[PDB]
Write a protein that binds this ligand. Structure first.
Ligand SMILES: Nc1ccc(CNC(=O)NCC(=O)N2CCC[C@@H]2c2ccccc2)cc1
Length: 164
């Protein structure tokens, strides 16, 4: 079936727990495969050690810039950027897993987990998964964000990987 991956997340060096995500390979296989491989680190790069650099309450938690750590970088397993696969899945509510971008067809590694329905992003950002467990962990991450996105503690993916 669709892969399951995990992120273990700290806030100023204190464990928050684990987020488990289903990647919807059956709808967006390319986009799903990118995230998977970046969780495992199997290409020699990926999410381990990187941060949630932009977190806004009642919107979303953004992470995945493992090259520059500032929200400008990241790269995919296909090269630095790749196209929008499709917009079949929608931003239907909390726990949606979606690709951050800098305009049409600029997916790299940056991603976000929604904390509400973000239906205004439908057709703008490729949804490619959903939280299976750890939505309480996402709420804790959310509690360290702000209107601007600037976080109040350093939110770190200490470890990540593939479960199935
Ligand atoms: N490969 C790559 C991907 C993203 C960027 C930075 N762009 C960004 O952060 N854009 C905004 C974005 O994607 N999102 C996703 C949800 C939160 C935020 C956003 C979107 C719409 C309005 C306000 C913030 C640079 C390189």
């Amino acid at each position: 079936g669709n892969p399951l991956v995990y992120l273990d997340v700290d806030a100023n060096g204190k464990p928050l727990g684990r987020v488990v995500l289903e990647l919807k390979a059956d709808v967006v296989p390319k986009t799903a495969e990118n995230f998977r491989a970046l969780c495992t680190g199997e290409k020699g790069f990926g999410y381990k050690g990187s941060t949630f650099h932009r977190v806004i309450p009642s919107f979303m938690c953004q992470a995945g810039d493992f090259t520059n750590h500032n929200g400008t970088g990241g790269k995919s397993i296909y090269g630095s950027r790749f196209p929008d696969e499709n917009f079949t899945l929608k931003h239907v509510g909390p726990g949606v897993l979606s690709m951050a971008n800098a305009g049409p067809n600029t997916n790299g590694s940056q991603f976000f987990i929604c904390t509400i329905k973000t239906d205004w992003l439908d057709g703008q950002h490729v949804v490619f998964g959903h939280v299976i467990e750890g939505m309480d962990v996402v709420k804790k991450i959310e509690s360290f964000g702000s209107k601007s996105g600037r976080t109040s503690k350093k939110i770190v993916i200490t470890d990540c990987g593939q479960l199935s």
